[model samples]
Target chain A: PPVHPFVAPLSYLLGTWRGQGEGEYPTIPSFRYGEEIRFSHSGKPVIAYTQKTWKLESGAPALAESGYFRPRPDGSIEVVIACSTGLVEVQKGTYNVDEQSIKLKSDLVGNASKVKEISREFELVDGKLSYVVRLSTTTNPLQPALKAILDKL
Target chain B: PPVHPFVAPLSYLLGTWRGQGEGEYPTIPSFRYGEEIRFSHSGKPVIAYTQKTWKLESGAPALAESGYFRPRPDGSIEVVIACSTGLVEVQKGTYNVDEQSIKLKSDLVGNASKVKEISREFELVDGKLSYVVRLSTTTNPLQPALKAILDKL
Candidate 1:
């Protein structure tokens, strides 16, 4: 493998992590899924990111997201993720390698017709990873949309 | 980590793959995007799958999908994917770990109010991975909606 200089703090994210999370929104009721995420490196400047969530009760695929994590020279980071529900997010934020946590606020959000603006926070606790997305939509007013806690595998 | 029993042909897929691809359909014009997919195993019966695509010219977030590849006892395979576009696909097919390839057909497609039926096929050749999705929708017939060639890293 080629040596990637921009790998660190975030390097700890290069693994498959799975866990359970609950999702609730104004338009949707509370639900849970088995979520899996992988931050992979491929000799690219940014880390490749992939995520899939399965219904914990049925094992049916619930949703998926894909994008990239570009780390800046000064420790800043940007993430761009797209979903099948016609939603896209371009997020900018900072990280604390020490805290093993990254929180992001969306600079812009794209949608097909009526999607929500989403901000996310990802952090590690006791070797377990969890994330939560706050939403701003027509029906929602800056509320928690989804949250999940996963284990590294 | 515990070693999973069945791994081969499928093992070749364990990594981050990225490349450029073109999408065309009767209802949509031809467009290009940068696509990345990751297949990872964590001593599980199935491999986790995540895919994200971006606009090739600008590298903007485009779309994403997530699912799983369950290799059956007889070497046959099954895949279930959920997209951000309010679409879900349950595919069944077979694979040739020798050829480093797998082909799948959708057993059933789940969709939102006005979504379409989607089927997908995946293969690896000469270290390059390629896959195509066929769609049957209200505006378009059964035709090629997306195709991409990727290199594993």
Candidate 2:
């Protein structure tokens, strides 16, 4: 079947992707580990979402979360995600067709403290998906937060 | 490092998988072309391979192929793959595991026709990953595309 025109811009991101990423915290040393992300569409107005367990090589769960992307009336996209670690974040962004990527900035509105992150996604040549993320403040060093390649089984 | 016994069953198949597939000819009178497939794998050696494809909505392709999977002589495992257009293939390879996914680099040997045509890495989930495939072939009895989902199961 012919693909919908709107789907083309995000076609490159229509499957599951996984890769290594690193980050730092206020007290912990810089950590390097794996990340898995899946992007799927239901041919509806919204994109379905789900994420699974991430484990350290030593077999400890690092993170587990699930979320969905919904198109907003103003031509923006809203992301609502929940994690097992008692964190919930709502992200807002728009797809830049000219760049063939999506730019999302998320703010963590929780009971404790507020955290913010900005992430940019783009396609890589070797059939791999790549993303750059800056946390807390945009000035913070951008880190390769997450990467997942498309898969069809 | 050794792979956890839990993930041993589905490791080795990581990366983008593409090929042509041929199945029994249809009983109806219609054009039949070969199928073009793409499978992506990410994360550890367990469940990571996801597949999707393109083909004539009505006919099949002249040739067919899929990502490589087979057991090895040394009680280990191997994966091989090829492309329908090139006819060449990558028949075997080694898989490396990361925190969230597995990577397979080809070391294939066989007829020159069998060389690595595509590389895939699958996203791991619950020690497994799942993907969907879209083939060009259609059911003899037409149904809504939504109905097609049931066929996949």
Candidate 3:
């Protein structure tokens, strides 16, 4: 089957990605993690997305999030993510086809989440999937939370 | 790795399920769909869930949803689901261990969605996974929207 036109622009992400990332925040200690992300489409108009991370050394599961990526009529992207930690986020963003880049900002965060705001950026760099997340929480302002470069598999 | 204690009680759902379903609403005509659901864990405290449906006749994709199921310290359950249609839902529910049944009610539905409320129920009946969904929208009140019986694969 062919990819739906609505999500054709994001087809580049239609696979599994694995790599290592670093995290730091004012309320939490700095740490290293191994992460895996998957973007899948079943001839659908949207992409199903999931991400999981584990402690680099102990191999203990750390965080998991799952949601959907929908392409809006205005050529923008809408992402809704649900974290295992009981938080849900609604994000609105745009994608640049030529640059193979995406930028997103939090539109809403619910469920008593400590996160006040979030920004996510993803781009392909030298054939690798590179991404970063900046987060602002109740006790801290927006700052680097995690970043990684991953290989598609 | 063994299933995490927090999601141990839900271990029965850790597999793939496939079946057919019927859906109806006042705003739309009745229809049939084929659905597949997967529940997975990675030695984590939560269960990752995804569901996709296709048209029974054309086999075209209809809807997709993904999220996480978390166990609360108080012996209840929390579920956060994001639909490909650009809606995010926060659901709180309870599970009856004896009857192998679970019930959920939406606490919030956001993203300017027409859906105002949703109720879901799942139970094992005669070795089959049976579930039903009732929904309410801005134009209509709560009513049966979909129901299905699935077999583990």
Candidate 4:
């Protein structure tokens, strides 16, 4: 099927991104061992966003989430995300076309709790994708979520 | 001093504008309103952005703001505005040369704050000036903000 008008421009994001991320969350030593992000477009107005995170030591599932992404007519993009914790968030931002990346600052509402989620410094290089997630308004540092290299499979 | 490279083309925004606008919030508003905006370049890279609001009953100040407006190498306009309330915003968009007007789409503060303004129907009637502006976002109403600034000697 032909690609949707809205999804055409986002074809470049249809793959996997992996990398390492480290930071302290609430003090005790914390780290994300293997992080993987997959992006796919359905040739429609929205793109599919999914990610998986694993602990380096135990190889346990650390986090998993999925969402739908839409590009606004005003040259900005919006992502509606849902996490394993039953959280939904709407993120908005502009893409740096040359950088092959997107940074979305989102406001999330989950279980009657509201928070600011900063998903900044998203970059894709040599088929590898890396991202950092910072919680709320606190500078508790960024916790690396997904860092494993992606494969198209 | 000679005018900056970006200042010349920005002259299109000099007079006034009046028109209708409609779109959805978080993207655009679903209504139309008459809008007017005036721009003046100081033979430099920066331009002054001032706007007025009008109704059949009375006219008020809509945006009495100023900003540095410049042109990108790609032939698009960039406006860094500082509102009266000390809020800073950056808007990047293009112009319609054939239409004798400039349309600016704001990308700052995300989609919920995306604002678009179209300035058109420019005229310099006997040294006095007037035009129209159409705004679409948050509210929908045709408000006029016509004015006549002293011409440059």
C-alpha lDDT score of every prediction, in listed order: 0.73, 0.42, 0.86, 0.50
Tell me how far the alpha carbon of residue A114 in candidate 4 is from the true structure, in angstroms, after superposition: 8.0
How do the predictions measure up, each by TM-score? 0.53, 0.41, 0.93, 0.43
Lowest-sum lDDT 10-residue window in model 4 chain B = B144-153
Q: Is candidate 1 or candidate 2 better by lDDT?
A: 1
| Regions of candidate 1 where Cα sits further than 4 Å from its true position | B1-153
Best by DockQ: 3
Per-residue error at A123 for model 4, in Å?
A: 1.6
TM-score of decoy 2: 0.41
TM-score of 4: 0.43
Put down candidate 2 lDDT per residue, A1-153, tens digits, no spaces. 333355555666667776666656554477666666776653544444545544558654455544555554445666555443334445568876455556666543222133445454544435565556545633445444444443332
How do the residues B1-153 of candidate 2 rate in per-residue lDDT, one tens digit apiece? 345453454443333333333323235243323222333222333232222334546442233332324333333344433222212223233333454333333333212232222333434444434222212222333211110111111
Identify the CAPRI category of the predicted complex in candidate 3: medium
Tell me which of candidates 2 and 3 scores higher on DockQ.
3
Write the residue-wise lDDT of candidate 3 on A1-153 in tens digits.
688898888889999999999888786898789999999887767888889888888878888998888875566998898888888889899988889888999898878557899888999987789999999987788888989988999
lDDT of 3 by residue, B8-117 (tens): 88788899999999988886798889999999987777888889899888878888888888875456998888888888888889987778788889898879557899
Let me know the DockQ for model 1: 0.05
- Name the docking class for model 2: incorrect
Better of 1 and 3 by TM-score: 3
In model 2, where do residues sit more than 4 Å from their true spots?
A1-5, A71-75, A111-126, A137-153, B1-153
Pairing residues by index, what is the TM-score of model 3?
0.93
Query: What does the lDDT read for residue B26 in candidate 2?
Result: 39
Give me the overall lDDT of model 1.
0.73
